[PDB]
């Protein structure tokens, strides 16, 4: 059983541990937001705006840093920064949960605001490090480990997505059970300790991956960062894979989704916790099914064909959702149609996400890989920022319908862009 020590499985294990830590810490921050502050749209929206704006500004910088440095150095530095930021965030969360009563009742009104500012800043740093490690590990390391074998690359990307979704659905359950059977302070302490141990393990895991793969070793003072940012965006605009990236970014403008504990429109609206949990589980299983569908489609059709088919599926499911919205309290038929439309949209969208990921991994030269992927993340977070702005501007319930249309419209728009990419690449159906 040499599979347990191969580069591919060690990469899988490292990604699994990193994603588990990330999701546990995300759930801890969500619990911090819910317990201290009420179910407020403004606070979660401000957190999302801060994270999205920071990544939008610094995507090119992070990509350039990944591109200009050795692979092991950037991977380990990003790992250490992410885990240390998560450890500090966990310690602060344990401290606030320990003094929750005093903060809510006895202490002045500025201490809670200071705690929120500190938590969102540490979360922004952790998310920046997570974006850096995602860029480097996924793009560079998975492409190099796969090499010239595209089937292996597609299987590795699909397995990464499956691990990500399973962790997204399991880590909230584990942290919730731990917190309830103990206390939120115990939960935050466990999260901090687990992140420390996982950092220690993942350092050695990345070092061992770097050994078994010998191909990884080959490869105003703000004028320079601004020049790198401009050069990165100009290079991104001149890539053949640009409309596909634009479509993938536009697919982030949607409100229709159940994959996020906080910053989700359904939770902000006031939907019951049990229904939200059921919908998140259904979205996770359907996302796994979508990754399987992508892996199957890529072999039969091409890759651009796989993207087109996935976009067609997602548009059909969102058409079902629109029919639900326009269908004449509210009848349970409309709600069931909307939920089915969103879930089947997820199954049709994960395949397109994997297709665009494979296109970026294949058609971006090794010299521009980090910068182009950083700019792609910047575009994704820019359209996520637009989504958060839209959610802020329309908080009243009797506008939800409108949002749906907007969201669906953008999806269509995104896929239209990808369709143009197809016409620029194949010229055949």
């Amino acid at each position, epitope marked *: 059983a040499d599979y347990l020590t191969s580069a591919k499985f060690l990469l899988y294990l490292g990604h699994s541990l990193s994603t588990w830590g990330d999701r546990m810490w995300h*759930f801890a921050v*969500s*619990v911090f937001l*819910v317990e201290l502050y*009420g*179910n407020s749209l403004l606070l979660t929206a401000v957190y999302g705006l801060v994270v999205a704006g920071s990544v939008l500004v610094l995507g090119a910088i992070i990509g350039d840093w990944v591109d200009k440095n050795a692979r092991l150095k950037v991977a380990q530095t990003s790992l250490v920064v992410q885990n240390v930021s998560v450890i500090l965030c966990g310690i602060i969360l344990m401290m606030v949960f320990l003094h929750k009563h005093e903060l809510l009742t006895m202490y002045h009104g500025w201490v809670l605001t200071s705690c929120y500012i500190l938590i969102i800043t540490i979360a922004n740093i952790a998310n920046l490090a997570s974006t850096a490690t995602a860029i480097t590990i996924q793009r560079d390391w998975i492409v190099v480990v796969a090499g010239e074998d595209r089937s292996k690359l597609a299987n590795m990307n699909a397995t990464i997505r499956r691990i990500d979704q399973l962790t997204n659905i399991l880590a*909230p*359950m584990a*942290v*919730g059970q731990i*917190m309830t059977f103990g206390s939120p302070v115990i939960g935050c302490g466990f999260i901090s300790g687990w992140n420390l141990v996982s950092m220690c393990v993942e350092y050695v895991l990345l070092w061992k991956v770097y050994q078994k793969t010998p191909a990884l070793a080959v490869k105003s003072q703000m004028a320079e960062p601004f020049r790198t940012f401009r050069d990165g965006w100009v290079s991104y605009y001149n890539q053949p894979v640009f409309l596909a990236g634009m479509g993938l970014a536009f697919l982030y403008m949607t409100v229709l989704g*159940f994959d996020c*504990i*906080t910053t*989700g429109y359904a*939770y902000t*609206q*006031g*939907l*019951s*916790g*049990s*229904i*939200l*949990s059921i919908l*998140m589980g259904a979205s996770a299983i359907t996302g796994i099914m979508g990754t399987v569908a992508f892996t199957w489609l890529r072999r039969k059709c091409g890759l651009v064909r796989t993207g087109l088919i996935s976009g067609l599926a997602q548009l059909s499911c969102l058409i079902l959702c629109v029919i639900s919205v326009f269908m004449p*309290s*509210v*009848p*349970i038929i409309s*709600v*069931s149609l909307l939920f089915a439309g969103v879930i089947a949209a997820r199954i049709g969208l994960w395949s397109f996400d994997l297709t665009v990921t494979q296109l970026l991994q294949e058609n971006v030269i090794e010299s521009e890989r980090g910068i182009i992927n950083g700019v792609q993340n910047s575009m994704n977070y820019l359209l996520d920022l637009l989504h958060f702005i839209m959610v802020i501007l329309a908080p009243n*319930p009797e506008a939800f319908g409108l949002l749906v249309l907007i969201s669906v419209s953008f999806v269509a728009m995104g896929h239209i862009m990808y369709f143009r990419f197809a016409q620029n690449t194949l010229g055949n159906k």
Partner: nanobody, 120 residues
Framework: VQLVESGGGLVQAGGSLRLSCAAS????????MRWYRQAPGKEREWVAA????????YYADSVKGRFTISRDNAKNTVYLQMNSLKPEDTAVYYC??????????????WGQGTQVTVSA
């Protein structure tokens, strides 16, 4: 996200009553609203419920038929209409919300409660 109750009092056996539960911090059209009875000398018991997504009622067998639970989203309230009250229904009624929160972190939120007395 507390909710209050009103409409309790003392009525003759076989009369009619309407208990109104007003919620503030959440929608009532998407949360499973419930009613509970707490009788003197014994633990609280289930009375009625209403679904979260649709509109379905789940009255308990002991009080099924003579009770009605109806939600109103415009006023964000839940009404328990009690008809043909019996002397053993004298208790304290608690409005309840089950599974309110985020995805995997939800709780049960109770109300102050209203005293209902039945005499013959």
């Amino acid at each position: 996200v507390q909710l209050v109750e009103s409409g309790g009092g003392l009525v003759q056996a076989g009369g009619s009553l309407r208990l109104s539960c007003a919620a503030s911090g959440f929608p009532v059209a998407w949360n499973e609203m419930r009613w509970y009875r707490q009788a003197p000398g014994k633990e609280r018991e289930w009375v009625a419920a209403i679904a979260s997504i649709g509109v379905t009622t789940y009255y308990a067998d002991s009080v099924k038929g003579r009770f009605t639970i109806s939600r109103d989203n415009a006023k964000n309230t839940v009404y328990l209409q009690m008809n043909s009250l019996k002397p053993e229904d004298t208790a304290v009624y608690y409005c309840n919300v089950k599974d309110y929160g985020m995805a995997f972190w939800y709780y049960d939120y109770w109300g102050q409660g209203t005293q209902v007395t039945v005499s013959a």
